[PDB]
Design a protein around this ligand. Structure first.
Ligand SMILES: Nc1ncnc2c1ncn2[C@@H]1O[C@H](CSCC[C@H](N)C(=O)O)[C@@H](O)[C@H]1O
Ligand SMILES: Nc1ncnc2c1ncn2[C@@H]1O[C@H](CSCC[C@H](N)C(=O)O)[C@@H](O)[C@H]1O
Lengths: 327, 327
């Protein structure tokens, strides 16, 4: 016994996310021809599930590297499944692990909220450089970031709550809408929240593409990744801000398999990352929404995501609002 | 503007709790004959809603005392409802507020999780002693605590999760049930969680009664409140521990109005407080469950609730497990 509530809950949530975990299983299995008889490094193996997917896909040897105490559980899951000759669970950070050979492939689930919040991406790139054979397989191989203006229905309900008190209790609290807006939208924190398709006000725009084999990607991440965007709204709505999300792609190796966290696709534990304006803005059919967005490490905590945003909605003047990931 | 996310969310949750807020409205209105033309102190007035209920009930003057920044919102709700001649919002803690008279009544919603976690009860008793007229009204007037053995279905699902991985992903993770049990039940924290009637394994037992007018109740709270209990289980079940909850009573004052947080009654934001055994124990029809329970302030933080529990299930030996409120 050690206190392990966080350990089990985090791994439960990941494995319960079927969209995530099936995307990795099928993404890996579809590369069976490239993995059969080959070696694999699983960066951040957790409970060992992806390492075992690789063995199912036919790998001769999988190195399951895991820095935290959950490695103990990984060792047990492998022993219990009788795969200890094929999957070797190794303690500690990938940056200092010692493998006996370069590998044919790396597999990793490294993506954080907003893709880059508290992500293991730097560790995956460190391992690719140190251990992956020239021309080796990376699963997934790339990631893309998307942005779109949104109307959050749950936020709308919360903003309107104070005007419904009279109907329920004979006390008029509608004067608190200002207060509620300032508290719920006036902050500078990125809010993780699940939206649906009807919340999306325009065509989503891709604003960055991250090819994990690209030279200098580590330095891109430090300078900031992102870019400009532009879109046109579909109809009348209270725009509350933007949602950002990602997808990652597995080569087939056939056509690629995409794991998406878009509000149009089945929900994942990543949900989306929301960037609220200080207050709502009414948009109409064809309202132009544009801007420039950058994702980079926070100054005071290099594993916390910060977002620099400059945007323009219709005829409103350009505005800056910069965010950091919620506590 | 100040950062006020916590402010609005806490008050939203309280006012959205209709069971709570209607119990106070009807509890107060039913005492209209005793309040009409009289004076009231609202201890911890928040947004001012209970103070306005008192004015609706006919009070001549209500002192709405509130220690934190939400007082500013209270002042606005009163101004906006045009009740500033009848309801006076006053800043700061009730312990140092200066009223111009003793009052005919105190109203307060002071109850925390498990009744006594981070509760304002000491402040209500301080105000009763300092400001309430001899024979004055207290709303509510009393509280009662209850305990019962439980089977938590949501916990059961979480304990069983690891044995379902094989069906979904071809990896057998059933060997992790031990781990999951240790992490989810082996800790010593009180867990706030909503149960339903079917989770209850026996007749609930009252283990304490707190009459707010009782002399020396402050000293009882410091020594610990609680007592012994005994009950008999209804049928075969995996017992996970105990749930505790409270009710408070408003004199009519007609028959009393009771605000209950029992799992048999409509859900409130208080839910119930759960005390998990280190692992499940199978019980049967007529299994005797007994013990002794005390609620008191934690040593290192006098506003955190601690629970001392000694219990016996059937033929199992007596056991001690002591808890402190979750972070
Ligand atoms: N630098 C590093 N080296 C090794 N493991 C790391 C690491 N940084 C984070 N980790 C671990 O990587 C894991 C990411 S979570 C993904 C777990 C598992 N592969 C699954 O898909 O279900 C966590 O268990 C975390 O402890
Ligand atoms: N010692 C004290 N004096 C005055 N206010 C206090 C206090 N201790 C806590 N409070 C305040 O008491 C409130 C309790 S929450 C209840 C709020 C409101 N009466 C309602 O029923 O909706 C909080 O707003 C908290 O800031």
């Amino acid at each position: 016994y050690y206190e392990c509530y966080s350990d089990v809950s985090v791994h439960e949530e990941m494995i319960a996310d079927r969209v995530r975990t099936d995307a990795y299983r099928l993404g890996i299995l579809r590369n069976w021809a490239a993995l059969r008889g080959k070696t694999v490094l699983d960066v951040g193996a957790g409970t060992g599930i992806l390492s075992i997917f690789c063995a199912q896909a036919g790998a001769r040897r999988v190195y399951a590297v895991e820095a935290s105490a959950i490695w103990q559980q990984a060792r047990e899951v492998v022993r219990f499944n009788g795969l200890e000759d094929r999957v070797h669970v190794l303690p500690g950070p990938v940056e200092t692990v010692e493998l006996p050979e370069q590998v044919d492939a790396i597999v990793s689930e490294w993506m954080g909220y907003g893709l880059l919040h508290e992500s293991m991406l730097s560790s995956v790139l460190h391992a690719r450089t140190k251990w992956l054979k020239e021309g080796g397989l990376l699963l997934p191989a790339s990631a893309e970031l998307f942005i779109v203006p949104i109307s959050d229905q749950m936020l709308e309900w919360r903003l309107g709550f104070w005007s419904q008190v009279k109907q329920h209790y004979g006390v008029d609290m509608s004067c608190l809408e200002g207060f509620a807006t300032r508290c719920l939208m006036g902050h500078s924190e990125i809010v993780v929240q699940g939206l649906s398709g009807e919340d999306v006000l325009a065509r989503p725009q891709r604003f960055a593409q991250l090819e994990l084999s690209r030279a200098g990607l580590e330095q891109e991440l430090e300078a900031g990744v992102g870019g400009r965007f532009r879109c046109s709204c579909y109809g009348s709505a209270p725009m509350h801000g933007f949602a950002i999300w990602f997808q990652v792609t597995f080569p087939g190796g056939e056509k690629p398999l995409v794991l998406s966290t878009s509000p149009f696709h089945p929900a994942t534990h990543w949900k989306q990352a929301l960037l609220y304006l200080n207050e709502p803005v009414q948009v109409e059919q064809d309202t132009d929404v544009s801007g420039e967005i950058t994702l980079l490490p926070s100054r005071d905590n290099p594993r916390r995501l910060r977002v620099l945003l400059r945007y323009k909605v219709g005829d409103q003047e350009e505005k800056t609002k910069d965010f950091a990931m919620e506590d």
